[PDB]
């Protein structure tokens, strides 16, 4: 049970739950959750791992397979087993007299730590993407937007981070396989 819960969702009026999933290392992960969706209401988050859908194990499923199963799910009612944000970690820092915690970032990724800052003391790492600051999601925001959130924060700055190589793999959108097939499997029948 640790870090794992079972949820029940119901498709909305349009037959949707508000997800895009992605196959990574023989698991299925949440790539996108739509705001004000069935999926958002049961607390699905970017980077969550989906272990089962409607009693079936997701292990080894392609993105296409997972989407197909949800699309073709006969019930209004859908069960999922979720492992919550496995690749995220939380770091809490405190602003100095200039209002800073001590790290340099670009494109949402931490690239340098200032020695003897709060970030240093708390062991913040580079090559990590910021996911949330003080409860506000920053995935997809511009650096100026991130800067504004940090600026307006109080002294206590609690961030979640994820290794950049994992983040990039989860967020990266694949071509339709439709196209990948067309281009991969070019073998004439006759």
């Amino acid at each position: 049970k640790q870090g794992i819960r079972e949820v029940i969702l119901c498709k909305d009026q349009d037959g949707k739950i508000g997800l895009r999933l992605k196959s990574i290392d023989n698991g299925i992960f949440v790539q996108l959750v739509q705001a004000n969706s069935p999926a958002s209401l049961v607390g699905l988050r970017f980077g969550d791992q989906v272990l089962q859908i409607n009693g079936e194990n997701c292990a080894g499923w392609s993105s296409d397979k997972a989407h197909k199963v949800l699309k073709q799910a006969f019930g209004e009612k859908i069960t999922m087993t979720i492992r919550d944000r496995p690749f995220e970690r939380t770091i809490t820092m405190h602003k100095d007299s200039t209002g800073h915690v001590g790290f340099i970032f670009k494109n949402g990724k931490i690239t340098s730590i200032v020695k003897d800052s709060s970030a240093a003391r708390n062991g913040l790492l580079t090559e990590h993407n910021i996911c949330e600051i003080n409860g506000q999601n920053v995935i997809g925001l511009k650096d100026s937007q991130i800067a504004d959130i940090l600026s307006t924060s109080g002294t206590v700055v609690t961030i979640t981070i994820m290794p950049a190589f994992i983040f990039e793999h989860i967020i990266k959108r694949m071509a339709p396989s439709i196209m990948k097939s067309l281009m991969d499997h070019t073998i004439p029948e006759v």
């Binding site: 800073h100 915690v101 001590g102 790290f103 340099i104 970032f105 670009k106 690239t111 340098s112 970030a119 650096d143 991130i146 800067a147 940090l150 700055v157």
Partner: peptide, 8 residues
């Protein structure tokens, strides 16, 4: 060298 980075 890195350029146009942001300090937090």
């Amino acid at each position: 060298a890195p350029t146009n980075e942001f300090y937090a």
